Design a binder for this molecule. Structure first.
Ligand SMILES: Nc1nc2c(ncn2[C@@H]2O[C@H](COP(=O)(O)OP(=O)(O)O)[C@@H](O)[C@H]2O)c(=O)[nH]1
Ligand SMILES: [Mn+2]
Ligand SMILES: [Zn+2]
Length: 595
């Protein structure tokens, strides 16, 4: 082993004695190692190599269809006390959990190689690099971790001899007995994704898929990290980071939290529609925000790659995503395969009459009743291949945030854009973020789900304490230096069910109002829920849209808002005993202004 970190070595020994793998392998993150792992993945049938002419060094992997299921009920925050997980989290006593998972882990890696994968979340040049080591028996995980994090030799050296690091244990939970033939995608029917916040540990078992197995993606970046940030005085958030550049060439940085399927990728890849405006991205999922010497809040993307949703993506919908993929070095999971060895998914241009679907079965145009690609299939691709990546993406100091945006899907009630009255009000609007989405295993059609700061399934501690944490950071900061907070809604619909606002690139007009507000040069009316622009405060020059529709999108109707109040109240009761008085005070204030 290429290290003298004895704490690390002891942990590897202890784990290997439990899981009993055939051998242990430390990964260094080199290109020859990568090519070697891929070659082995092709041999196992886990990867198929894509036609080099269309894709350089790119692969397709098809998972076991039972391993793509949503696993929120199998995801746990195992703090010592239940109150410290809170009502948004699944809790189990830590001792009870360990006894369950130790039973599962004992002998689990029999007949398999056990990889030890060191990695860095965020740029290496940082002063306190957040380091982790993932142990996994999945080669697929190793390859994808290489793309999604700064993996290997550099992070291992940054660990020194006694540097702290997050212990991330993973197993697919499919031991092989000496005779046994493996399968392309091993996994178990028993799945746990468990987090021990006080010790900063992640124990995953039974799934080899996505955020369950690539332990930097959500487990580290939000769950464990939010707990760290809680204790250390910063923010680990589900936010894209956008760099907006004015015609006068001034850069404004925004962090925006939207729940999944509410537009984070599209805003991150914004192509402004107002002449002279440009946009670049630093990330579309996770933001780590820390106060600098400036007194300003600086954001860094702790990830190194994109794990984007394939279906829906095309040269019209997202040319920048397509260009990122075209450069190669990409792993597609659960998409379809064309007759000429290209990949395809619903929404991608082309009209393939026959495909091989994501289960290896023949698929036929206007015949086969199932999607060719899984509806939440993924591509995993390097960030550095993104043509609109901002040059400061690998800057350990991060970028100063001028604005924080919250938003979700609301057919009614919530205006296109609102500015918060002040920081505490901003925390309130984040805290009560609603979105008209639901899932199978939940049902509840028509429901308004509250997804606080877009963090409902990602908080590593009590949601009330989290709100208090947000409150405290602002309370103790230079008020003038804090980002302004904004609430947006792209999804308001008219009486006919049309979108009142066209959105996508035209959202650059909303961001322009936001910039203008930052620069103290735009108007906005005081309403009960905040400052909302009139239609003439927005730049609609060049936009073929009905002024009356824009006015409706911006409307704050006191009745709609009064009907909204009992929804907010029952959410705030659900938050429970740790609901901060600051959030309570803001609800009362809102109620008073609505009268
Ligand atoms: N009407 C409308 N739809 C949008 C807008 N932005 C994104 N969407 C749609 O919302 C869905 C999810 O968008 P995406 O950017 O992938 O969301 P993400 O999962 O949060 O990254 C897609 O079907 C988009 O077409 C918008 O500004 N207006
Ligand atoms: Mn996305
Ligand atoms: Zn996400």
């Amino acid at each position: 082993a290429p290290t003298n970190h004895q704490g690390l070595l002891s942990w590897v020994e202890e784990v290997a004695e439990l899981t009993q793998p055939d051998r242990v392998v430390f990964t260094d993150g080199s290109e020859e190692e990568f090519q070697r792992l891929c070659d082995q993945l092709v041999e196992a049938g886990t990867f198929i190599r894509l036609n080099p002419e269309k894709h350089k060094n790119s692969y397709l992997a098809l998972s076991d269809p039972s391993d793509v299921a949503r696993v929120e009920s199998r995801t746990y925050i195992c703090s010592a006390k239940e109150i410290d997980a809170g009502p948004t989290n699944n809790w189990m006593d830590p001792g009870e959990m360990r006894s369950i998972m130790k039973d599962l882990y004992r002998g689990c890696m029999r007949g398999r190689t056990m990889y030890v994968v060191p990695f860095c979340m965020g740029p290496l040049g940082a002063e306190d690099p957040k380091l982790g080591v993932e142990i996994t028996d999945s080669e697929y995980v190793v390859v994808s971790m290489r793309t999604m994090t700064r993996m290997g030799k550099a992070a291992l050296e940054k660990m020194g001899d006694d540097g702290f690091f997050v212990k991330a244990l993973h197993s697919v939970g499919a031991p092989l007995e000496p005779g046994q033939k493996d399968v392309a995608w091993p996994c178990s029917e028993t799945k746990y994704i468990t987090h021990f916040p006080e010790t900063r540990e992640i124990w995953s078992y039974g799934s080899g898929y996505g955020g369950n197995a690539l332990l930097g993606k959500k487990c580290y970046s939000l769950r464990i990290a939010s707990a760290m940030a809680h204790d250390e005085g910063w923010l680990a958030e589900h936010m894209l980071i956008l760099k907006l550049i004015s015609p006068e060439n001034k850069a404004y940085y925004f962090a925006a939290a939207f729940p999944s399927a509410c537009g984070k990728t599209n805003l991150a890849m914004l192509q402004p529609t107002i002449p002279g405006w440009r946009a670049e991205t630093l990330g579309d999922d996770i933001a780590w925000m820390r106060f600098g010497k400036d007194g300003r809040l600086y954001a860094v993307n702790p990830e190194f790659g994109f794990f984007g949703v394939a279906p829906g993506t095309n040269w019209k919908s997202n040319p920048n995503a397509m260009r990122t993929i075209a450069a190669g070095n990409t792993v597609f999971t659960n998409v379809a395969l064309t007759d000429d060895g290209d990949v395809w998914w619903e929404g991608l241009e082309g009209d393939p009459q026959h495909l091989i679907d994501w289960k290896g079965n023949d698929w036929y145009f206007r015949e086969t009743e199932t999607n060719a690609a899984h509806p939440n299939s993924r591509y995993c691709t390097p960030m550095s291949q993104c043509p609109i990546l901002a040059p400061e993406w690998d800057d350990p100091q991060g970028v100063p945030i001028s604005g924080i945006l919250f938003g979700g899907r609301r057919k009614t009630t919530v205006p296109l854009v609102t500015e918060a009255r002040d920081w505490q009000h901003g925390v309130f609007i984040g805290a009560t973020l609603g979105s008209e989405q639901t899932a199978a295993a939940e049902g509840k059609v028509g429901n308004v789900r509250r997804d606080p700061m877009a963090m409902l399934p990602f908080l590593g501690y009590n949601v009330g304490d989290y709100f208090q944490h947000w409150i405290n950071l602002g309370k103790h900061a230079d008020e003038s230096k804090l980002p302004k907070v904004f609430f947006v809604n792209w999804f308001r619909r008219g009486d006919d069910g049309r979108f009142l606002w066209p959105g996508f690139g035209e959202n650059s007009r909303v961001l322009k109002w936001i910039v203008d507000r930052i620069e103290h040069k735009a108007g906005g009316a005081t309403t009960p829920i905040g400052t909302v622009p009139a239609v003439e405060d927005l730049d609609l020059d060049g936009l073929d849209v009905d002024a009356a529709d824009v006015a409706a999108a911006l409307a704050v109707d006191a009745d709609e808002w009064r009907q909204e109040l009992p929804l907010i109240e029952e959410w705030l009761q659900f938050v429970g005993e740790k609901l901060p008085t600051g959030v309570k005070d803001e609800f009362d204030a809102l109620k008073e202004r609505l009268g």
